[PDB]
Amino acid sequence: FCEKYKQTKEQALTFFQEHPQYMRSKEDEEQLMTEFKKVLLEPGSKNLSIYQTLLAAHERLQA
């Protein structure tokens, strides 16, 4: 679990380097967290990587 955690953090870091607005802006981070929880409420969300979850949530804001 401890290694799984460090690797999930690394994946999250790369997504936030690809999308730097979110770590600069409280409002954007908030909107993203709202969509992120909504993705995670989807059936089968266990099967997503954190990268896939973050990208899905960001795409829901681009919609």
């Binding site: 955690y5 999930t8 953090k9 999250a12 870091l13 936030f16 967290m33 992120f36 929880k37 995670l40 969300s45 266990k46 954190i50 979850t53 973050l54």
Partner: peptide, 11 residues
């Protein structure tokens, strides 16, 4: 980062 990881691991 930690808030994103802790939410993800609880899905």
């Amino acid at each position: 980062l930690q808030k994103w990881v802790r939410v993800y691991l609880d899905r």
